[PDB]
Amino acid sequence: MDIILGIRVQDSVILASSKAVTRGISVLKDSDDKTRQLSPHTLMSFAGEAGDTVQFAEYIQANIQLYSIREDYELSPQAVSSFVRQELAKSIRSRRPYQVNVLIGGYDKKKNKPELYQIDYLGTKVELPYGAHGYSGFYTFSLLDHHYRPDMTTEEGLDLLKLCVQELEKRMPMDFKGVIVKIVDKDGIRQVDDF
Amino acid sequence: XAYX
Amino acid sequence: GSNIELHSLYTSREPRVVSALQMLKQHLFKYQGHIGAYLIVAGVDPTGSHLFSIHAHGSTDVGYYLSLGSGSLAAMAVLESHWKQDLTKEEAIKLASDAIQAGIWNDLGSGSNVDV
Amino acid sequence: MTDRYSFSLTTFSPSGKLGQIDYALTAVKQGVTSLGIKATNGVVIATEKKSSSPLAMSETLSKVSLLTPDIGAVYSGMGPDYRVLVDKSRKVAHTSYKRIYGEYPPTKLLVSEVAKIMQEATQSGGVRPFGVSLLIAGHDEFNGFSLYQVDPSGSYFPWKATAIGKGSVAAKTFLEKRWNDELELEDAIHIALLTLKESVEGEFNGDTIELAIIGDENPDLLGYTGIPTDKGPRFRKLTSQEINDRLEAL
Amino acid sequence: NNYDGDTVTFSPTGRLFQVEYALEAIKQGSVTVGLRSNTHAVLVALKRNADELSSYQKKIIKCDEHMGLSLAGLAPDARVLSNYLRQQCNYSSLVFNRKLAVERAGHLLCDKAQKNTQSYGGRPYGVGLLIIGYDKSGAHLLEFQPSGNVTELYGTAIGARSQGAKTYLERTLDTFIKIDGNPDELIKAGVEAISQSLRDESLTVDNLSIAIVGKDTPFTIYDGEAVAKYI
Amino acid sequence: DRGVSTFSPEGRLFQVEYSLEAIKLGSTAIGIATKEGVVLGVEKRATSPLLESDSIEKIVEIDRHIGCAMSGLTADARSMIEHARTAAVTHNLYYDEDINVESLTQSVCDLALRFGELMSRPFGVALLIAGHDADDGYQLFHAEPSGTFYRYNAKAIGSGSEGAQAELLNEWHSSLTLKEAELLVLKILKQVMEEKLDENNAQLSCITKQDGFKIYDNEKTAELIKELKEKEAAE
């Protein structure tokens, strides 16, 4: 099963996402990027049913990019998250719901604050200092409850996330083939190569 | 749900 | 109740129980029992006094004494024992509230106070 | 078949006039006089029962209509247009309010809904405007007593007192002199009967005059007892006898 | 005049001008002849070219193995009506295992044309058709007018100068009706009939179009050097 | 006003006859069919010298074996081309073969009279549809907004049509080579065009069985213009 973690530190949001794509007892890919850039300062990671995940992410990406062009303005992470929630909240009562869980990591330029949002396929939304979806969830929550602080630096955030992934590699019974880590700060969205 |  | 009020205004006539009865049964039948309403419909109109029962599937019946709900068998026992033709008002209230009491005491579904 | 009139029959003329709305107002002008007066403790609406034939039973034709227990309506212009508006007004009071909030709409919002129906007949495809002006008197807990006029355009205005139709210009002048902010309901009825006598030619009695009030709650007209908060309708139509009683003290 | 704006308007004398104008499109169309015996039914059509570089517009359309028509007027309207016949002939076969009677094919065309003369927005069909066929009651020739009027005939002609061919057939009636079990002689009589409607121009190899259906003859069209025999 | 599908007292559809006037105002297009192929040529007619002429696309590919030249309200042709391409590909999907040039033309012409009160008016553009199929070989069709289509050995449409058609009447024979047909299109275009014919204001194209439908380069057409000038100066 797929690991998607999020940690909001002092001045950024860091999203770790598992690189493996698996169907049954087959490993389809070992270098998958389970993320879309919604806007220059907003990143969404996603895990769930095949097709639904990408189809939903790309649909959300298109709608946010359209808003940006029309108003020549970037929607706040709070606004983007509310839009995404409402799209998932529609889908549950639809003929075939999107089975997608998402994390939304954004830097609000107006408030100069990093924001992390956890939304499940039902459209259940919460703002958290740290979040996770799937079996890895419970473990990472207990570990971050201990080590996490609000005033942590980006480097401190990465080390704590490094510890989570290390611990998950031992404890989890599936090979999730490592993670891709992406930081969201005032300067935008960049990928951490060394992990 | 409620239901005399 | 809303549609009966509009009908009363449209016709310039006080509404009739048979109208409410017809409108209720045709609605409940449309929904094939999925609207779980079991109603005892009573009233006075220019035609006279009327008492009907209507089940959730949209079947209706006429009677001098009716009971519905989980306590219907406790209530009917009292009604079958004590009812007679040509009841007075004071006798009918007594018999009615006695039939509810039977339900309140002997049925776990029924309880608290009696509304008349 | 099919309604192939999907286009507006009311358009702007080079002068900026909407012809059909003006012509509708002209139809209202030809119509019999009706008026409304607002007192401190009630509202009165009145009109003449212009009987088409003496063989006709004028009681059967209601020019003053109950919309809700606390809201009454009277008109000037085309009677049939009024009758269908009353039907639509009564229904929208239920569908767009009572079935949502579990209470009757306040006067101004029911007026707003009637106004909307009449604006649509002014813009929608293949229809002419309604050929009526309405006077709607009503009470509600938070606004108190109120009186509104509604025109074929869909425009509505609140009035202390006004008149519409045949002798409106004269009637409005008469009301301006008699109206004050300290009028009791009985005073307003007296002024309403005086004002209406000027615009009537023939017989002037309870059988030729239609008059209703929005006043105190009428528990005797509720039809049931046992719920303290239900005190009965504020709309009451005056009887033939009740009008004649007040014509002796005239 | 004031009553020719649309098909939904009668004139004060009870005339439908839009229908009469559609009838005019036919008279402008190139001549086509129809005639039958007891055994065979023949269509003969004079095809019209745009210029010397252009082809000669096809006049005869096959509807089934036992039925087809020739057209005079708007070709696109002939395509719509022929396509409708093809479907009705097809429906009759698939559902009832029954070859559609020529008389019933006429009744169906009539009813289709009529709807377009009583409804606003639409227009009448701008084409006349000569339907030939062999069914359970033998050989048949029908004339369709876009007014809706369909007529069963021994012979007829429609289009420009059609009156010449129609007069000839009216004289030859007793002769050509008796041409039984001789397809070539019935075509000869058809070619001699259409010849009464020619002026200046004569029948060439790429000009003449012939079709035949009969007792043991499926509806077949003859064009090019196949009709050189009859020139 | 009056119906859009109304017949005139002469038995013609007003709106169709009026669209035929719009086509007469259009830029010239010429088609010549031979046993070696079918040539299609157009006048580009740029409204200003600042207009990049190569962007003027009045010769259009429908399939590998069917080309198309247009004249009139050329904007109206986009949906006709779209339908033709779809018809050609769809038929290949259903039957695993090339669609007959006549069938493709018939499909385009079925749109023509789908107007009333469907689209609001007829098309204001005529098409020369050129192609090859195994059954009837090299073919040139004229598709009108009436829904009628004629096959032609050679045909001119647009402003210089009746002048060009009279020239094609004399010049066309059954033994024309492709090289001869190319020069003949250039010759008649140069005759009826307002501005002087060069490689930038006129465009050639052909359809052969071997190479299919090709729009000629400006460098290639330039050489055929130079070849024409020399052979006309030769007598």
Added chain:
Amino acid sequence: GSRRYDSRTTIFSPEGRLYQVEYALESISHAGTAIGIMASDGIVLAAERKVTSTLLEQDTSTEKLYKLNDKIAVAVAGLTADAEILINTARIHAQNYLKTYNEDIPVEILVRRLSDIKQGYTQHGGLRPFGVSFIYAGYDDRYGYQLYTSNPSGNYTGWKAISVGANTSAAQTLLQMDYKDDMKVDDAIELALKTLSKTTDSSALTYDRLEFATIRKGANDGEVYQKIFKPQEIKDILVKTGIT
């Protein structure tokens, strides 16, 4: 058929104008004057009621100034009934945006939507356009205080100070003369009333013939208050500025 009686409300004149839009604008030119003035610290909306009566209930009356949400208000010029149709649409769009994004709608987005609806009635449907011009007074945290107008054409433009309805030519000249950029709300109130007082077709400008509204950051700290002036409050501001 029915074609005979169709006015064709959505066609161009030979000059390339929209007949029904031009005639609708002619209609609006007869409506009571509405003025908007935008200051550094707030916005003013002033509007003249059309020849009132002594028997019109003024305190419960609203024909000119309407509330779209807590941050945005409109002044109306034209058919009141037509305006109410559009106002309820705008009120719903504002609440749809709030439901979706959990943020109050930016002023321009609401204005663009209403303007896009008006445009539609000029290009398709064959219905008459809305005989309404709006002055939008609003605040958001992107552009701050904003004044816009829309007209039956569906065109909208931004303004420092603008008038719609009657005598706009005269009104716009007076505003263009006395308006400065560093101007404050109290000054903008005085300008709005002085402008109406000079352009009015009435003998004198009184409290019973006016609707007045301000959108102020004059709300305790970092927030925005809408004030729809009561009859007695309009009477007070008329004495203060020295018009009565």
Added chain:
Amino acid sequence: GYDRALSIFSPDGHIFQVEYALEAVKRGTCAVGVKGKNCVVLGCERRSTLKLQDTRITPSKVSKIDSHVVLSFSGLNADSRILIEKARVEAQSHRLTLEDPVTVEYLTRYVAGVQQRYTQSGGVRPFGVSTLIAGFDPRDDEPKLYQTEPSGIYSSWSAQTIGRNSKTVREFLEKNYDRKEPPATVEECVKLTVRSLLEVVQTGAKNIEITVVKPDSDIVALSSEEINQYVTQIEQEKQE
């Protein structure tokens, strides 16, 4: 639904509603497009009949369709918004299905398609709008400038103008624009665009808007002072 055929043929084979739509464009404020060697510039007229305008919030004449394509127009402003919205949606729809931004030619062909559809659809009038669509195709350094009009015809232009007195500024460009050597730099290209507008505008104050689009989604709108420096330099050279 309202089905009435508003765009129909006349006896002389003209569609008057489409031609009257071009008259709306003629009335619209002047718009000019000039492509240099490595850039395209979109100049636009702002009629100075409207002062007391808030230039911060007033809809700007040049609209971004994507990060790499811009659309300016002449004619009915309200009509232009409907084309811009449709174009912006199609731009995102193309990125979503083709995994590549639209070419300038493709976006033009789409907008032109929409304009055409509104000339033979029941119940609708043509768009009273002509557009100039300019930009650079993905991973391409070749400048692109296209024009559309109510009829739905579109074509590529070295340089082009539309709107009121476009005849005059087209005259200027036809003699002043050399194809063999187009404006080499951004400066040269902006200067020629400002010069072309000064033939028509009136005052070189807040009446001229300039937008410079460079390759790889590099789009910037010049300020009042930046444009005023071009206006100053042009007239100082003219005094000779």
Added chain:
Amino acid sequence: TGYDLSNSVFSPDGRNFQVEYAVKAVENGTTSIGIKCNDGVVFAVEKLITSKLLVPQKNVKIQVVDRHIGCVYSGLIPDGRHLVNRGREEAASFKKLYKTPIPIPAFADRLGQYVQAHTLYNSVRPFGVSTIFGGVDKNGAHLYMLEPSGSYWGYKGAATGKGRQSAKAELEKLVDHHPEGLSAREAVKQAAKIIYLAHEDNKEKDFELEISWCSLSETNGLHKFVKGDLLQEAIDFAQKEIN
């Protein structure tokens, strides 16, 4: 003026001129008649022989509805066919629901309401036919005549088309000279005579006689065409009466 350009428009008279114009198309058509006999109805029609090329007895004008109702009309023949097609749908739906064949008065109103509907809207044209129809039901014989307005009544005899005045005169004599009634076989003979007499108004072109009948005794209350010997017997009687 202009009140006659659109269908469903009342003139200042209170008339629908488009319907009155439809009547002109009817007056222009060939003669058709109906005769109500003792236990049934007889229908006859004039078929103009335009050309020798017309196949005799092939272009049948009289139409059956269900199995017991005969329909004949004068005016626009296609409009007649359209009305009968609807009649067959109405008769089918009635029999489907109520089991019994549609009674004639019931069937009459089905056509009546349909024809009247084509006078309510400007989007449709009135019917260009007068339709004579009838047959035998449980309550006996019924003859009806239906005009473009949607007006219909029961008739002892009916006539419409170019020779209607001539026919109406001959029908009025039979009613006077046979109060006790007329037999089915007599009515066939008389029908033939009345068409031949009414042909004086279409005397230019020679014609072809076509008769049908529904009789309780002669056809078992079913609609049948008069053919062979009985048709020739009626033609002979008719030819003898004009000479």
Added chain:
Amino acid sequence: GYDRHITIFSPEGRLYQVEYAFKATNQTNINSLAVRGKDCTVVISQKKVPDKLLDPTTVSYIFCISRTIGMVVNGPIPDARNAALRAKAEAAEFRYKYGYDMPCDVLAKRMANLSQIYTQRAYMRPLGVILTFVSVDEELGPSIYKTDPAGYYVGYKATATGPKQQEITTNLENHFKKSKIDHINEESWEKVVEFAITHMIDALGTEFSKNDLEVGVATKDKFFTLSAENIEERLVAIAEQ
């Protein structure tokens, strides 16, 4: 002047198509009369069979809408039958939905509301008919309610319709001015029909045979029409006093 072709207002605020529909009402040249007894409502109408070829039994302008409600029409028969079929349908639908027989005055209102729509919607023309509904209502007793193309309706003590309505109206007006009651004080409906016929004779100044009249009677729980013989008995009684 297209404001005279469809149902839109004229500058005078008038609907000409409604006014011209009223004129179509008299096209038949037939006069109808309706009166109320104690226990009954009687409606009489002139019957004119100009053609000898017509089956006189099928020539009627009186319709049995429901068992209780009768309707006489003044206007052309096509529009009359259109109105008849709709009223029959409406009366049946009402009984099914609300579980009691549609009252006379409620059907009148419903048909009047339909008439109003034709005066407001352009694509529908008004029907050129005046509908007179009669019954013995179980609440209101003997009832006369009349509808017109404008969508107007009202109750009547008595009424008359047709070319000579004003002559019949004044004749009835003058009778009720004497008696000072809203009905005919008569036990049997037979004598109320005799009154109706007698007062029409006096008003029109014409004598009637059995085939010249058409009578409809409403009693409690049925409305029925009289045969030629039933009318002959009525005419004999009138003559013998």
